[PDB]
Amino acid sequence: MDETGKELYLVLYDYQEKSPRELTVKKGDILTLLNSTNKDWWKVEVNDRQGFLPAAYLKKLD
């Protein structure tokens, strides 16, 4: 995706947003991390969109 040098996060499972701030994502999506100040809900970006997701849906790739 667009920007370079970013950590990549894999979405393990589909997630359907429960509020307008949240993201809807599909298994296999690749995300970047915008803000984590807790281990449970993160602000992330996928394909030009930004929103909140539960961190349990994500695996850091390395």
Considering the domain 9-60, what is its CATH architecture? Roll (2.30)
Q: Where do the structural domains in the chain lie, given as residue ranges?
A: 9-60
Q: Say which experimental method was used.
A: X-ray
Please tell me the distance from the alpha carbon of residue 43 to that of residue 41, in angstroms, as a whole number.
Answer: 7
State the DSSP string of 15-36. Answer: B--SSTTBPPB-TT-EEEEEE-
The first and second tokens of residue 36, run together, are 């984590």
Q: What is the resolution of this structure in A?
A: 1.3
